[PDB]
Write a protein that holds these residues in place. Sequence first.
Motif, PDB file in Angstrom:
ATOM      1  N   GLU A 105     -10.152   0.329 -16.912  1.00 18.19           N
ATOM      2  CA  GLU A 105      -8.717   0.193 -17.232  1.00 18.19           C
ATOM      3  C   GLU A 105      -7.605  -0.599 -16.503  1.00 18.19           C
ATOM      4  N   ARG A 106      -7.955  -0.495 -15.199  1.00 19.33           N
ATOM      5  CA  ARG A 106      -6.956  -1.294 -14.326  1.00 19.33           C
ATOM      6  C   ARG A 106      -7.134  -2.803 -14.559  1.00 19.33           C
ATOM      7  N   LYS A 107      -8.519  -3.219 -14.910  1.00 18.40           N
ATOM      8  CA  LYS A 107      -8.754  -4.636 -15.127  1.00 18.40           C
ATOM      9  C   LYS A 107      -7.962  -5.387 -16.279  1.00 18.40           C
ATOM     10  N   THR A 142       5.693   4.063  -2.984  1.00 24.53           N
ATOM     11  CA  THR A 142       4.760   5.220  -3.544  1.00 24.53           C
ATOM     12  C   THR A 142       3.366   4.803  -4.231  1.00 24.53           C
ATOM     13  N   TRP A 143       2.539   5.324  -4.593  1.00 24.05           N
ATOM     14  CA  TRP A 143       1.383   4.863  -5.316  1.00 24.05           C
ATOM     15  C   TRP A 143       1.768   4.237  -6.621  1.00 24.05           C
ATOM     16  N   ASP A 144       2.545   4.972  -7.148  1.00 21.84           N
ATOM     17  CA  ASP A 144       2.830   4.567  -8.720  1.00 21.84           C
ATOM     18  C   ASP A 144       3.921   3.190  -8.400  1.00 21.84           C
ATOM     19  N   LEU A 190       0.828  -1.028   0.131  1.00 25.07           N
ATOM     20  CA  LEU A 190       0.160   0.158  -0.090  1.00 25.07           C
ATOM     21  C   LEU A 190       0.964   1.260   0.047  1.00 25.07           C
ATOM     22  N   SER A 191       0.297   2.307  -0.161  1.00 19.55           N
ATOM     23  CA  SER A 191       0.895   3.641  -0.167  1.00 19.55           C
ATOM     24  C   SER A 191       0.301   4.571   1.274  1.00 19.55           C
ATOM     25  N   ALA A 192       1.047   4.601   2.259  1.00 20.63           N
ATOM     26  CA  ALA A 192       0.218   5.061   3.554  1.00 20.63           C
ATOM     27  C   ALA A 192       0.376   6.706   3.668  1.00 20.63           C
ATOM     28  N   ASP A 193      -0.400   7.074   2.512  1.00 20.62           N
ATOM     29  CA  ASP A 193      -0.639   8.389   2.369  1.00 20.62           C
ATOM     30  C   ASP A 193      -2.128   8.854   2.060  1.00 20.62           C
ATOM     31  N   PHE A 194      -2.959   7.941   2.721  1.00 19.77           N
ATOM     32  CA  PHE A 194      -4.433   8.076   2.225  1.00 19.77           C
ATOM     33  C   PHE A 194      -5.333   7.826   3.294  1.00 19.77           C
ATOM     34  N   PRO A 195      -5.111   8.458   4.557  1.00 16.24           N
ATOM     35  CA  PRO A 195      -6.074   8.362   5.758  1.00 16.24           C
ATOM     36  C   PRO A 195      -7.618   8.483   5.162  1.00 16.24           C
ATOM     37  N   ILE A 249      -3.738  -3.543  -1.247  1.00 21.59           N
ATOM     38  CA  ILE A 249      -5.021  -3.096  -0.488  1.00 21.59           C
ATOM     39  C   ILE A 249      -4.627  -1.602  -0.015  1.00 21.59           C
ATOM     40  N   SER A 250      -5.017  -0.670  -0.898  1.00 25.89           N
ATOM     41  CA  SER A 250      -4.424   0.791  -0.693  1.00 25.89           C
ATOM     42  C   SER A 250      -5.674   1.609  -1.036  1.00 25.89           C
ATOM     43  N   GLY A 251      -6.932   1.382  -0.992  1.00 24.21           N
ATOM     44  CA  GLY A 251      -7.777   2.557  -1.368  1.00 24.21           C
ATOM     45  C   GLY A 251      -8.080   2.520  -2.844  1.00 24.21           C
ATOM     46  N   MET A 252      -7.632   1.421  -3.694  1.00 31.43           N
ATOM     47  CA  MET A 252      -7.724   1.332  -5.034  1.00 31.43           C
ATOM     48  C   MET A 252      -8.980   1.252  -5.622  1.00 31.43           C
ATOM     49  N   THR A 253      -9.482   2.215  -6.332  1.00 30.07           N
ATOM     50  CA  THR A 253     -10.803   2.115  -7.325  1.00 30.07           C
ATOM     51  C   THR A 253     -10.728   1.016  -8.231  1.00 30.07           C
ATOM     52  N   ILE A 254     -11.816   0.314  -8.312  1.00 32.40           N
ATOM     53  CA  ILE A 254     -11.852  -0.780  -9.213  1.00 32.40           C
ATOM     54  C   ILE A 254     -12.323  -0.168 -10.645  1.00 32.40           C
ATOM     55  N   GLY A 301     -20.595   5.805  -7.237  1.00 28.52           N
ATOM     56  CA  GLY A 301     -19.332   6.044  -7.182  1.00 28.52           C
ATOM     57  C   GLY A 301     -18.245   4.972  -6.995  1.00 28.52           C
ATOM     58  N   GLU A 302     -17.006   5.510  -6.679  1.00 29.27           N
ATOM     59  CA  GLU A 302     -15.895   4.801  -6.562  1.00 29.27           C
ATOM     60  C   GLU A 302     -16.298   3.742  -5.734  1.00 29.27           C
ATOM     61  N   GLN A 303     -15.769   2.337  -6.030  1.00 27.06           N
ATOM     62  CA  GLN A 303     -15.786   1.250  -5.291  1.00 27.06           C
ATOM     63  C   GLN A 303     -14.318   0.643  -5.112  1.00 27.06           C
ATOM     64  N   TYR A 304     -13.924   0.522  -3.800  1.00 28.41           N
ATOM     65  CA  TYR A 304     -12.419   0.028  -3.730  1.00 28.41           C
ATOM     66  C   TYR A 304     -12.467  -1.398  -3.813  1.00 28.41           C
ATOM     67  N   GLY A 305     -11.270  -1.990  -4.179  1.00 27.79           N
ATOM     68  CA  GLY A 305     -10.996  -3.310  -4.333  1.00 27.79           C
ATOM     69  C   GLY A 305      -9.778  -3.864  -4.180  1.00 27.79           C
ATOM     70  N   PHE A 362      -7.822   5.185   4.993  1.00 26.65           N
ATOM     71  CA  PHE A 362      -7.694   3.991   4.351  1.00 26.65           C
ATOM     72  C   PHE A 362      -6.430   3.265   4.788  1.00 26.65           C
ATOM     73  N   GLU A 363      -5.233   4.141   4.611  1.00 28.22           N
ATOM     74  CA  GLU A 363      -4.139   3.824   5.122  1.00 28.22           C
ATOM     75  C   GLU A 363      -2.991   4.964   5.373  1.00 28.22           C
ATOM     76  N   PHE A 364      -2.276   5.098   6.642  1.00 30.89           N
ATOM     77  CA  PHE A 364      -1.784   6.391   6.951  1.00 30.89           C
ATOM     78  C   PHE A 364      -0.813   5.914   8.137  1.00 30.89           C
TER      79      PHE A 364
HETATM   80  N1  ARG Z   1      -2.955   4.766  -0.782  1.00 31.68           N
HETATM   81  C1  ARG Z   1      -3.667   5.549  -1.694  1.00 31.68           C
HETATM   82  N2  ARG Z   1      -2.640   6.685  -2.113  1.00 31.68           N
HETATM   83  N3  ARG Z   1      -4.688   5.552  -2.340  1.00 31.68           N
HETATM   84  C2  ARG Z   1      -5.118   6.369  -3.514  1.00 31.68           C
HETATM   85  C3  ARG Z   1      -6.385   5.900  -3.959  1.00 31.68           C
HETATM   86  C4  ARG Z   1      -6.765   7.108  -4.908  1.00 31.68           C
HETATM   87  C5  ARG Z   1      -7.977   6.305  -5.979  1.00 31.68           C
HETATM   88  N4  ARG Z   1      -9.163   5.676  -5.209  1.00 31.68           N
HETATM   89  C6  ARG Z   1      -7.309   5.372  -6.886  1.00 31.68           C
HETATM   90  O1  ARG Z   1      -7.669   4.320  -6.852  1.00 31.68           O
HETATM   91  O2  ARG Z   1      -6.418   5.947  -7.749  1.00 31.68           O
END
Ligand code: ARG
Length: 129
Positions: free
Chosen positions: A81-83, A56-58, A15-20, A73-78, A101-105, A22-24
């Motif tokens: 494109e990503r599929k 990092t996110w990237d 994960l990228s721990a910069d997204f309270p 597991i990092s707040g990632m929207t389904i 809206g955004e659903q995280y997976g 969800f992870e921080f």
């Molecule tokens: N840990 C994070 N930085 N998460 C960012 C998630 C942002 C957005 N939900 C996406 O999937 O792109």
Amino acid sequence: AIDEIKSRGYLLVGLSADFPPFEFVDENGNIVGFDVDLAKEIARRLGVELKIVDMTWDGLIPSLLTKKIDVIISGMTITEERKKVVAFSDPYFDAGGGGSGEQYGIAVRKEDTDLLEFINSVLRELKKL
Ligand SMILES: NC(=[NH2+])NCCC[C@H](N)C(=O)O
């Protein structure tokens, strides 16, 4: 994928721990949040320890593709494109309510269908409560 994780004795979650929330990183330098709790739940159910890899996110999809982590597991929207590149669990967070809206997976490598199945069964049990 499951037998390998079980033999290794831990689940590697990126994960990228910069997204309270969800992870921080809290005020004592610990990585915390909703996704950490979910990662712990999955690890417990697998009968393994949890190892969180902060990056990092990237960095996350690359690390997943190259097998340096088992899951994201990092707040990632389904998204469609990503599929093209990864597989996603069932949604575990709905930013909009009603599935709008955004659903995280949880992202998994496409070939790791047993892991994906297993994660889906844990999400389905958690949602039943
Ligand atoms: N840990 C994070 N930085 N998460 C960012 C998630 C942002 C957005 N939900 C996406 O999937 O792109």
